[PDB]
Symmetry: D2
């Protein structure tokens, strides 16, 4: 077996993954896609599998696609990256399967956004389908607030930042739950509590079964191989899926959970892509 | 059976589909997604089939995704819109199956782009993955031009534009060939010649549409390509290549067809509505 | 005397100005700066006066500047357009002279902005220095709202949008007052009332206009403000304040006047052309 | 006398200016405008002089303007920042006075840009009026390259980044000359040479910085330029020209000087502080 690790900005995660490959005696090399171009050639086919780690979605998407063209299986796959990287696409797969999500209405213009606000009532959450580190997630309390948010989103220099995901405002336990799965296997979860005085959110949490099931069904449906899952507790739904990440960070995960994520990843790869 | 026609900007094409639905006695609604929101609900499940027609790529993608959540059969589907809407994703699928494409190198940074230019030599073509009416398709003559184009695309606000498709510059037949397929069957093709003061063939620049005699090699290229990407109602842009015969350049997942109609005499909307009636009524 | 009329989008205003020039028998040409380039040359010196009417601020600024280079007297001048087109610059000049403005704090970063909010308390108005038809004028009710607004403006293409004007929220007469001055003489004023229910009175969708008796306090406020900015043909936007009486909100250096005319029955174009003849004929 | 030093990102230059103030026994405060908001008041009037050093134009412009509102003399002033920070406004002031500049044509749309190219002939330089470390300065060799550049600028698509300055391509001695002046006094000049694979001298990794003997024609050119813009502490970028001798390309209102300092051995900060004391002590 030989693996290629695809990176652009090498963080602790990619170092850990590199380190895990070496000491598990896996043949590998690194291609830095911030530095090297990717031909549509046939001899990238020398790798049995690629670990897709670029820090930007377009780099992850396109490097996976190029490697796929050469017959190389990528973790994660280009289709999975396209789904996890877009909340509307993620919500669509989950909703179809009956996996709970925050109650959501999609609006694709300023006019539609106001109508969605009106259909949903206040308070509500409005976020775009892309990015963004808690960015552009707005808690909207009345029509005046909505109208100014609509105007600000309209003037964003990006097209997908203009689609609105209009959601119920979930407030129950004041925390975000993040989990990591390798294949169908849940490694663990930790909780991120909302800081004072915010409305928006690091300790290990014991995973009850209701949580484990929510997470495992979510990964199965998006076909994820190495992903994180962000979960919100809901008073009636129990647990709803908020987000999947197809290039998950795990330094904050490793410290809360004690799980050697990198080791689990390389073991997984050995089991499934060796011969 | 009932159909939703999803639109934002109503063009001749959308009017034609609407009229074709009415004239074939198909129960249809139109939902304008530049005006109305789309809830993730069971209610839209009242539609058996959605005809996805927004002009904007994000609007086609998301309207299709929401309708799919409700169990509606979308033409085209969101995964298909995601692939067709992106030349790198399209080239990736096509290359894997050995369907000819233009020789392409993918560069995802300024540094990587310069390397691709040097690996390839000049002149070359550099274009982004998304689509732009031939906007941002650059004929790069040298390193200076490459560097300025790199610099410009870096500063544009949506990161897909940071990915450079660095391609062979095809010079041969002096035209673009555009075909349409319905349910993986070729309807017809036409050609749009490069106007005399350019090197791109787009309608947005020039060239009247003229019918093409589709040979067997061209027919099979189209069918194989549309089949691999699973497009149910697509157009396919093909370039004639000195060595490869026909290479697939683009697939469009919300195909234009008023130019295609004048060149080919084919009632595209009629054939679409027949195909839907025949395959999704029960 | 020869006049150039500089336009990009021809509105009723520009038609009116062309008519008034023609009807007063003034030699004029029109240059559309969305169509035609402007050389730094001495050729343009054939015009004695330029009337600067492009709808975009940058086109007004730049066309004025190129005309000034050739020695043409521009109305308004580029210096004046730079000042009037920017609320921070305008407020600075007025404040120095003791001309009342809304109480304002300027914040040039996310951190400064949060401090400004907490310094003045809520509700408050937050707007950028650069106009936008009452867009991006936000009524900020709390810290959560200010934080999201800050986050949004951080991510726009124009760095001027990152400067926050953090203002007292004026609630008194439920209207704006717009006046027009030519050569530092007041023509008149009218009012635009806040529609129920908005916090902004802009034409879109500011039903309804009405009229106002200009008292001496309002007249002098307008004259003083227009004189300090050196505006030769401007509109000025005034808010009636419970304590300060009249405060200056904005000057417009390419004033609209279609609505001013319906309200006041004043021939703004005629007054402009007579002013130019009286002062610039030689 | 007391000075306020206005900063946002403290670079060597700012540290050096702070140090010079300290060593020369000058009472001074620092206000970091990336951290603190700026009220309109009378209290900032405690400062006799403000040294405006924010790294971003909007912060320099707006901090200067607020300080001016309080009666504080700013180095440089808001009007000077507005002129120097915009090459069209700079070229306009210089051209009116007969100070040589690169032959320039301003175009304010895609359509005008192509007409400007045709008027200018090839090769030409096209750059926006707003700085960017040689960003978006394009060397255009024919109409195809021109067409793709126009397309890329249109998609920026913010700012004055849509306005084109279309210039003669100057190529004589393969270098840029940069000078610094305090008041009307020229401190000196150095050259930045174009690196083997370039047309710009900024420039990531290039611009090997040679010291340069200031002749009288150069000195006249620089002094006249600084006189017309009323700069108090500026850099001036000059190009050698076969027929014009020297032309002014740029002025900078927040000049960098660590590189200038090492090329000329001029203690810029010291000279600045000496000048402030000499002039603003009272
Ligand atoms: N519908 C919602 N109800 C309550 N809180 C939410 C909701 N959506 C998002 N949040 C909060 O906002 C934060 C960021 O939202 P998220 O959807 O994760 O955007 P991003 O993808 O930028 O991180 C989450 O940590 C969560 O606390
Ligand atoms: N590799 C190439 N060689 C020659 N011509 C090309 C090449 N790529 C694109 N073109 C020309 O440029 C035009 C636009 O290209 P295209 O890839 O279709 O971009 P878009 O999807 O934005 O229209 C087409 O008409 C085609 O003639
Ligand atoms: N400080 C304020 N207090 C109350 N209302 C305001 C304030 N500032 C602006 N407004 C309202 O918002 C509208 C738009 O504000 P304005 O400053 O004129 O922005 P723009 O330059 O885009 O028109 C004004 O008509 C006025 O009614
Ligand atoms: N008209 C011109 N002719 C020749 N070289 C030019 C011309 N304009 C700019 N340059 C070159 O490009 C470089 C950057 O140009 P400049 O006008 O200074 O833009 P910026 O403000 O982004 O630095 C200059 O240092 C000079 O080398």
């Amino acid at each position: 077996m030989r693996v290629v690790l695809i990176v652009d900005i090498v963080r602790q995660e990619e170092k850990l993954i590199a380190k895990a490959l070496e000491e598990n005696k896996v043949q590998y090399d690194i291609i830095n896609v911030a530095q090297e171009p990717l031909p549509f050639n046939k001899a990238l086919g020398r790798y049995d599998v690629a670990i897709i780690r670029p820090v930007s979605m377009y780099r992850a998407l396109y490097s996976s696609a190029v490697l796929e063209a050469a017959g190389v299986h990528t973790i994660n796959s280009s289709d999975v990256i396209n789904v996890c990287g877009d909340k509307i696409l993620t919500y669509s797969k989950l909703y179809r399967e009956g996996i709970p999500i925050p109650d959501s209405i999609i609006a694709l213009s300023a006019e539609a956004a106001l109508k969605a606000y009106e259909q949903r009532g206040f308070p509500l959450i409005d976020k775009p389908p892309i990015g963004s580190w808690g960015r552009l997630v707005s808690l909207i309390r009345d029509v005046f607030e909505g109208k100014t948010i609509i105007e600000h989103r309209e003037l964003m220099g990006n097209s997908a930042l203009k689609a609105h995901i209009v959601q119920e405002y979930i407030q129950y336990k004041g925390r975000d739950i993040r989990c990591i799965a390798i294949g169908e296997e849940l490694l663990g979860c930790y909780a991120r509590n909302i800081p004072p005085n915010e409305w928006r959110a690091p300790s290990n949490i014991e995973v009850d079964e209701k949580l484990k099931e929510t997470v495992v069904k979510a990964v199965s449906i998006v076909h994820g191989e190495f992903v994180s899952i962000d979960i919100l507790e809901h008073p009636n739904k129990g647990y709803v899926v908020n987000e999947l990440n197809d290039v998950p960070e795990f330094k904050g995960f490793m410290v809360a959970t004690n799980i050697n994520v990198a080791q689990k990843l390389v073991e997984y790869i050995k089991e499934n892509y060796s011969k």
